[PDB]
Structure of Thymidine kinase:
Amino acid sequence: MVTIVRIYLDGVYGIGKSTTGRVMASAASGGSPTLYFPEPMAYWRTLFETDVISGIYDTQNRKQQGNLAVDDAALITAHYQSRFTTPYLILHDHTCTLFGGNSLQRGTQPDLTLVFDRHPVASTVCFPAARYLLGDMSMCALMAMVATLPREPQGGNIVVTTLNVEEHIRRLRTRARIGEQIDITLIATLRNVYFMLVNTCHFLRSGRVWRDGWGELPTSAYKHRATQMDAFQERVSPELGDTLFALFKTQELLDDRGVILEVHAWALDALMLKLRNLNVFSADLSGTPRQCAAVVESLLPLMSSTLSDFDSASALERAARTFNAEMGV
Amino acid sequence: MVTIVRIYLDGVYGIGKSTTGRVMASSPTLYFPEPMAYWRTLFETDVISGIYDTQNRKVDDAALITAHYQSRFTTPYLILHDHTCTLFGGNSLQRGTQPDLTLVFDRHPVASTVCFPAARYLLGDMSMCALMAMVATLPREPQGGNIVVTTLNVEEHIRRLRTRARIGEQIDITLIATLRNVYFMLVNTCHFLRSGRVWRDGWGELPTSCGAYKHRATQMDAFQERVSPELGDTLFALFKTQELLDDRGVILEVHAWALDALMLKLRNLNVFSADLSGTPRQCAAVVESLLPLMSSTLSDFDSASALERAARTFNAEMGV
């Protein structure tokens, strides 16, 4: 038998996710034998007749320019948003058959650590949520995305990466073209959405449910605040209004009476059940890559581990080798 | 402990599955209808109008808009699946008795995520990429599921669809023919997995489905139901395409994983067929007759009440 700790590293782009993950996988970094699963980049650019990275931001240009109807521009955007998801769903279907069960917090160092660049939450929930709040996407499209989030089986750990805005923009800046513009509005919205995610999991871990405070909560003004730089944070004890659930109390989902339809309630039930099994953490990436790797590394004692066998652990290693080689550039 | 038999009534449209379902409910029987309101009524867009109106291309951008609409068909199915899968219970077994409760669902997630799209790249209206996209979103069927594919001789099917259209309408006959082939492939896939085999058994010794295979899959009566089918009679066969292989002709591992998922997700689907030639009451009788061959799960009193609540709500919210 083999003890396994699995970690999804997530957050806003340009913070230092991949670099931290690669260092964590290194071996110069010590700790437990670690396997890194990078972003499925080939899948997006190189394996099919289209570059989904192109399309996404490009559609936001064609719509601005007046190159495609705004009704069409919300539709082809959505389809690309959908394509981001596919490789994550596939990786998830594959590896969940191998983690094993017996989730526990065992405190000791595992036989083996897995590190995934991004959890399926990123492309099915967070990124679409951002786009909906900015007005690039409808509620109906968001629900299309959100419904495709898979259930996390027992044992999962998600580490959301944090960083002060100054340094984050500075980090994007160094990596940007000549005098290329940075989308401050998107990052600001994406930064809040990830705080809403961290808050949500805290909420659910404290035994609370999306109905706890629903009647009192105002209708979702809300979208203004969602784009406001630093309007949201990691909260000690989260209230419904600090979580993702709050964006769903809007008119498009309610009665004539003002009561949410039971069918959208079912949708919020599913989002809850699906995030239940994600043990949540924060990691500040202020340091150098080495120091970042250590900030995440020191979260291990509170992390959940599963018991798997030697044959599955090997199957996870071939998976990682297969994934790295098939997803590069 | 309440004994539950859930059946998914599925197949190509315009045969009479909804009608059959409604009659079965009139052993107590619940009927979950299609999420019609969800698709047409609850939001600004009409996905049934949309996917038809998007075919005002009759050729490259349409393929992306029709693929997005396909996603929207799926949404309410994933929502209903997530709510009910909690309540069915475990202990799957073919007990051969009349259950305390039988659930009739209009269609399974497999229709919208696999059959209509999931490599519906077939008519060339959608791409392998857009396909993998839908197929990946197929939910895992928990133990005890039963699927009944409705079959109908093509003459009576075409008649039914015609005696339902108005002054200047069309029937996408070429879509109807393809769907009839894809649903046979679905039946065969389940028989094949039940037979103990796996998508790899026959894979090397299968011709690369490229160009010719798609054209064959759109001909009326090109496929049929077989108890012992060849790999080429299944949904697995359509994924051996140049688009998914490397230089040396071997399927990439990531694509292989997608076939495993599809495989695994279909495992607990006990498949049946039913001929819908007769009257609505006869069709229901045909389906009712398969009951003692089906899987049943053991649920608690509280969960079966929740399922009864589920159907009342769903019929209430999804009408028109």
Q: What stands out?
A: Residues 1-329 of chain A form a domain with the Rossmann fold fold (CATH 3.40.50.300). Chain A has twelve helices and six strands.
